[PDB]
Amino acid sequence: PRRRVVAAREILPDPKFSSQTIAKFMNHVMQDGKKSIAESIVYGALERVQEKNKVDPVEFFETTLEKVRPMVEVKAQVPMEVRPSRRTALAMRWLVDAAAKRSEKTMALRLAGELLDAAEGKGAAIKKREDVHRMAEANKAFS
Amino acid sequence: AKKGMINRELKREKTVAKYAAKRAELKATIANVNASDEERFEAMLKLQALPRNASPVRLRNRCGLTGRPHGYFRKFGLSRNKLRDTVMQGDVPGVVKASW
Amino acid sequence: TNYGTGRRKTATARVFLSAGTGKLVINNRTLEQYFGRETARMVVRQPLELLEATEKYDLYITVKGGGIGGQAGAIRHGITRALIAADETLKPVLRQAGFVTRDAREVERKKLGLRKARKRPQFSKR
Amino acid sequence: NQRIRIRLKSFDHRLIDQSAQEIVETAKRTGAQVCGPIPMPTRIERFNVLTSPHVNKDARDQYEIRTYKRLIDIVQPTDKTVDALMKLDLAAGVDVQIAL
Amino acid sequence: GQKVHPIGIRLGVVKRHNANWYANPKQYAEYLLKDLQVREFLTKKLKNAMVSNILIERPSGAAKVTISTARPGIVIGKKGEDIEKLQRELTNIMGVPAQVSINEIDRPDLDARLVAEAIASQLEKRVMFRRAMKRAVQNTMRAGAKGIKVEVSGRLGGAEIARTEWYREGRVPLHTLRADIDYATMRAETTYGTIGVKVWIFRGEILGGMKQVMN
Amino acid sequence: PRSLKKGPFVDAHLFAKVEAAVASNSRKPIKTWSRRSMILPDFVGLTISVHNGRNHVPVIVTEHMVGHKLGEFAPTRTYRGH
RNA sequence: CUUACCUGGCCUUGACAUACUAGAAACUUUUCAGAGAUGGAUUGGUGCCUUCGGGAACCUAGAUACAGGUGCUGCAUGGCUGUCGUCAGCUCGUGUCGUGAGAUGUUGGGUUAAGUCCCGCAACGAGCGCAACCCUUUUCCUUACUUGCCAGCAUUUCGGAUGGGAACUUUAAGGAUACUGCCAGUGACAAACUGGAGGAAGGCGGGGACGACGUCAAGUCAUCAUGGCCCUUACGGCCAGGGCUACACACGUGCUACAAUGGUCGGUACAAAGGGUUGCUACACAGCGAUGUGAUGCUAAUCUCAAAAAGCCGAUCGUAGUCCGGAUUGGAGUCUGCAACUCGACUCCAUGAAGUCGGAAUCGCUAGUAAUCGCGGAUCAGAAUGCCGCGGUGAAUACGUUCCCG
Ligand SMILES: CN(C)[C@@H]1C(=O)C(C(N)=O)=C(O)[C@@]2(O)C(=O)C3=C(O)c4c(O)c(NC(=O)CN5CCCC5)cc(F)c4C[C@H]3C[C@@H]12
Ligand SMILES: [Mg+2]
Ligand SMILES: [Mg+2]
Ligand SMILES: [Mg+2]
Ligand SMILES: [Mg+2]
Ligand SMILES: [Mg+2]
Ligand SMILES: [Mg+2]
Ligand SMILES: [Mg+2]
Ligand SMILES: [Mg+2]
Ligand SMILES: [Mg+2]
Ligand SMILES: [Mg+2]
Ligand SMILES: [Mg+2]
Ligand SMILES: [Mg+2]
Ligand SMILES: [Mg+2]
Ligand SMILES: [Mg+2]
Ligand SMILES: [Mg+2]
Ligand SMILES: [Mg+2]
Ligand SMILES: [Mg+2]
Ligand SMILES: [Mg+2]
Ligand SMILES: [Mg+2]
């Protein structure tokens, strides 16, 4: 805004696992206020991955989001360093967008699939991160 | 409105008032079961024979001060143009400007 | 033995709290019967879980009004006030946890000339 | 158990409250025991009225009218209570109904 | 921009209605139409008696009409014949029997409607409108108003193009809800058309609200 | 459609005209404005000129037309293409 | 019907007012011709006031001054309304410099939502605007105890149902609270701005009404009134049928979808606001159903519309123009209405179109908001995807003022 700065909107942690990151991803997944269906999808994916490979769901999700998180951006065109909140937001948006275009029937198992793909290193979100890195390198000199 | 239209309305109202009783009796006879189908048919035929302005379906609500046929507001018997003025002059008991 | 009232989005809850072993009843139904989500149950359980006194008291509750989330929030608020009445010294902990504050958010009214509270009609650009 | 029930309706809650308090005072002076007044829920009726004569859909006045109801119960009434209640005058704007 | 009605905006704030009676939804329309007819009849019949306010009540199967006038003698008549005739005529117009009451206005110069009526009469008799407005303003301010405003719109002096002009003196806080602000409109019918006259009189602020007014 | 319990609707004057026409063998067309009457079996073999708004179009009643309103055979609007 | 338009059939001091003259209580029962408007017959009756030698109400017949016009002029007007825009401005006295019109105040530093406030200054001060006074929402207290409520006692055909209680919820009147109040920075030491403690709530707490001087010869002679023009055997009035619903096309505003975060079926939860006596209807029976019949309680915190739906649990469908979508058409009905052809709503069986997310461009939204789900009402015999309201679930993002708009 022109005048003054608005404080960040506090988001209550996820009741089950007490993770603000999980709550933020859940809200990213939500559509039309259907929080119950979003919760079902996210908890189901976390439980599936935990059962498949024995790892703490919160730790694994944080580690994967770290890999998928970007590093640089360009603003209208001059490169700039992304802020921590925008980093996480872009990462989660990229994961959900790539899942939207994935070819599997459902969304929860199809989200777990992309989580494993990103953990391995090959995925649409990682490709988009590499593309933004390339474009930032191309416009590096400015600023 | 036009004075001819107002008088048409008044004439239709008078006709309805005149024929109210017989039309109701005929409807009851039509709807009666114990009576024979012959009597019910004759009642229906007479009902159809009643003059058209006897039917209340043809009455149109009109303002009451100007005869306007649109925006009637049954509760006040007045169209919006006069209702706004009468309310804002303080001549309609209990009516104020609403805010919530 | 102690009482509290809770309010959230047109919902009102009456909470009776007494020394007990951990029984909880809402409108003559168990928590899992009354609420179908896990989030509602966790919201109901937050205050005693924080106080580490879940199995210390018995809860008899009636509620009416609003929806499921509102009813859960009202129950939490009522339980919080009942616990404060039982022991005022819990008030700092509960106020830190944010259970003391009564949420005053409510639905904004529809406005003349608008589809909703703030959504306008579409405006053709010439 | 020859109780009496009084129902008050009004468009002005101050007027209806004044009337109810007058009734309560009269009953207490006569010596009977009274229950109430109990506030019954209000009726709110709303209306939208175009302000322009020809065409401006968004330009409207919003009006409302309120009906307030009060209930009074008189129990164990003395013979002198009924005549005093009947004597009590009628205030404009406050409809009063009495049931024995 | 357009202004709200000063009387209407204050109907439940500091001023009373001109009609006091309860009715069911079925009887409300009949009562309203009969009351409006009575108002229309009374205005015409008492045009020359300097009548400002009319208050109508239907207490119980009856009618009470209070007329605020600056000439009670004209309405009363020599020995009450006029009031008796008026009472009979209103009892004819309204189904229930009716009673009439007179309220003497001691100060016509603080009554908005009487001022507007005088201005309209002068304009119809072709007095200069600027003189009329100045004299009315000074008369009201001597009467003791805390503020006065007068407006006149139309074909002034029979001009081909109409215009509007106004004069104010004192203070008139229209946006202040608790202000006592009398308001009135009036028509002057001249050979060239209609001239509208509007009068505002500010008489101070009412303190205490409706409870003070003792509804 | 009109409920079966009430039977079909035909104007009394039109019905009287049709009854007279069947009773006495006359093929003169019957002029009517009653577009809303329903065609009955008794009409078959007759000619009814039905008003359309400015004219009375002649219609020869057949067995196929039974169960129709007279106005269905007298179109009201005129159109031939833009 | 509304209806102001068209075709045809009709009347003429008129469907409606005042004045003059004569006869008749008004009214009321049945037919005939006509599409109806109309015309012509045919029944019952002679009140109410009276100084009774008459008059009141209402009709019929004559008569002219007139009635009648949604005909024209929104550029001849009143009243009413849109817009810049809730943008923050517009002024006036007296002093002051200037021969002068004028200036000043109202200009400058910050600050704010703001000509809001504090500082300077030959200006001093005040008005209409801003703010506040009004309505609604959040915390608590007093009064009130039903038709509304049920913590503790009992009685129970386990249903606050009963005896009962006045506690809690709620209903609705009247009050308290919040004021930078306290604290630390901060700033010209001031205004003001940030961060803490208590508090339900902390810096206009959230919404609503309230529209300054003025601008567009802006809108409305078809709500109404009104100057002046026009028509008067019609530009007035009555009636039956048709049209306002047309259809090679082009625009604006919406609803429903293109599916798996979903469709179908079975089971099972939780609202707020309104409406109801020529009205809403418990319950039983009949029907696949829209509905029908009988019957019951409600003039309503009492009876009723009423099933909240998204939600949760279980099974099935497995990416197909499909178990997605529901346009179009063929049959068969119901109800409201004198009457559903032109031209109603709804119900059942059959049919199953376009559509697989939409170019350039362009629109709304800063929080209980957007998105999404259902519920009510005014108009109204019947006829909402429109309008005006109500609640349920409930996000994302603001680095900043370079760029577009005002
Ligand atoms: C696009 N359109 C809405 C315009 C527009 O855009 C704007 C705008 N500012 O944007 C507007 O002003 C308008 O809407 C509008 O309102 C106008 C008028 O009234 C008007 C008028 O009344 C007379 N009157 C006479 O000639 C009388 N004569 C006497 C004898 C014979 C005729 C003459 C005349 F040229 C006009 C101009 C219009 C223009 C109109
Ligand atoms: Mg007229
Ligand atoms: Mg109608
Ligand atoms: Mg909503
Ligand atoms: Mg609300
Ligand atoms: Mg609109
Ligand atoms: Mg059909
Ligand atoms: Mg028509
Ligand atoms: Mg204009
Ligand atoms: Mg125009
Ligand atoms: Mg203000
Ligand atoms: Mg113009
Ligand atoms: Mg015109
Ligand atoms: Mg017609
Ligand atoms: Mg149309
Ligand atoms: Mg399921
Ligand atoms: Mg389907
Ligand atoms: Mg295709
Ligand atoms: Mg904003
Ligand atoms: Mg309807």
UniProtKB/TrEMBL annotation, chain C:
Protein keywords: Ribonucleoprotein, Ribosomal protein
Molecular function GO labels: RNA binding; structural constituent of ribosome
Gene Ontology CC annotation, any one: cytosolic small ribosomal subunit
SUPFAM superfamilies: Ribosomal protein S5 domain 2-like
GO biological process, one term: translation
Matches recorded under Gene3D superfamilies: 3.30.230.10
NCBIfam families membership: PRK00132.1
Family stated for the protein in its record: Belongs to the universal ribosomal protein uS9 family.
Name by which UniProt lists this protein: Small ribosomal subunit protein uS9
Lineage of the species this protein comes from: Bacteria, Pseudomonadati, Pseudomonadota, Gammaproteobacteria, Moraxellales
UniProtKB/TrEMBL annotation, chain E:
Gene Ontology biological process: translation
Single Gene Ontology MF annotation: mRNA binding
SUPFAM superfamilies per UniProt: Prokaryotic type KH domain (KH-domain type II), Ribosomal protein S3 C-terminal domain
Segment forming the signal sequence: none
Keyword Ribonucleoprotein in record: yes
HAMAP family (alphabetical): Ribosomal_uS3_B
Self-association state and partner proteins as the record states: Part of the 30S ribosomal subunit. Forms a tight complex with proteins S10 and S14.
Primary role: Binds the lower part of the 30S subunit head. Binds mRNA in the 70S ribosome, positioning it for translation.
Protein name (database record): Small ribosomal subunit protein uS3
